[PDB]
């Protein structure tokens, strides 16, 4: 320890929302909430 631990899942989860078109903002948020 500490080291990366084993997984029986076989494959990474895919993240479909990564591939969504991006909208550019003129200003970034103060807070996330």
């Amino acid at each position: 320890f500490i080291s990366e631990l084993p997984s029986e899942e076989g494959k990474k989860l895919e993240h479909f929302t990564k591939l969504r078109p991006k909208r550019n903002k003129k200003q970034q948020p103060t807070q996330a909430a």
Binding site: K12, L13, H15, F16, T17, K18, L19, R20, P21, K22, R23, N24, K25, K26, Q27, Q28, P29, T30, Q31, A32, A33
Partner: protein, 242 residues
């Protein structure tokens, strides 16, 4: 840092969805450099706001946000006001208005209530948009439910202007719970995400909103069935097998 992003998105796939907002704010505190990508790729329950100048409700998400303000689809104005916030092109604002009206009707016909909003934004060689729908069921009963639709569409017009390529990524979040807390409390909640792609004729009789309307309708009809199977069949058989 794409490997960071993947880990964060992997995290949101495992942490109780009953706590999405808090986990998203914690996660951003944990990795501040991911703020922008997290806000764009992590779906959250939809919040309702009132546009006071028009007297209609609208839905909040990252796609109508700028700074800490949100744009209404009715009045096309940020709230709190903004000096310089991202706006659709004048041509696209026009389509955004038609699309809001169209999906208002769609919502009435499929949901018979709730609230909907549509936000569009210009791309280099097309445009994108989000269709939002929020419908709460009867919250007065022992069990209550809520439904959030988030449909993000990307549209690439072909040069001839006669076909376009449409890319849909749809999230439906489904929340069911007991009104009792805590002892005897039961909460079954979360979301499913699906993708559809399609080339379509674009013409006076098959315009963008109609082609997008059909894809959203197809998608939602399919996901409703899938939700039924996953929530009330699959998680139930898992329970039964414990």
């Amino acid at each position: 840092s794409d490997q960071q992003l993947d880990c964060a998105l992997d995290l949101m796939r495992r942490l109780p969805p009953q706590q999405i907002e808090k986990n998203l704010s914690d996660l951003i505190d944990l990795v501040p450099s991911l703020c922008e990508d997290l806000l764009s790729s992590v779906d959250q329950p939809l919040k309702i706001a009132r546009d006071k100048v028009v007297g209609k409700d609208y839905l909040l998400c990252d796609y109508n946000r700028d700074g800490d303000s949100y744009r209404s689809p009715w009045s096309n104005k940020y709230d709190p006001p903004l000096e310089d916030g991202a706006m659709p092109s004048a041509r696209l604002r026009k389509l955004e208005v038609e699309a809001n009206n169209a999906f208002d009707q769609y919502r009435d016909l499929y949901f018979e209530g709730g609230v909907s909003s549509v936000y569009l934004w210009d791309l280099d060689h097309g445009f994108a948009g989000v269709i939002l729908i929020k419908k709460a069921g009867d919250g007065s009963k022992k069990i209550k439910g809520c439904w959030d639709s988030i449909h993000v569409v990307e549209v690439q017009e072909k040069s001839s202007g006669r076909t376009a390529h449409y890319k849909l990524t749809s999230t439906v979040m489904l929340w069911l719970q007991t009104n009792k807390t805590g002892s005897g409390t039961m909460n079954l909640g979360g979301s499913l995400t699906r993708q559809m792609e399609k080339d379509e004729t674009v013409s006076d009789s098959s315009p963008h909103i109609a082609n997008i309307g059909r894809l959203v309708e197809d998608m939602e009809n399919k996901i409703r069935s899938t939700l039924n199977e996953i929530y009330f069949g699959k998680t139930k058989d898992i329970v039964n097998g414990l």
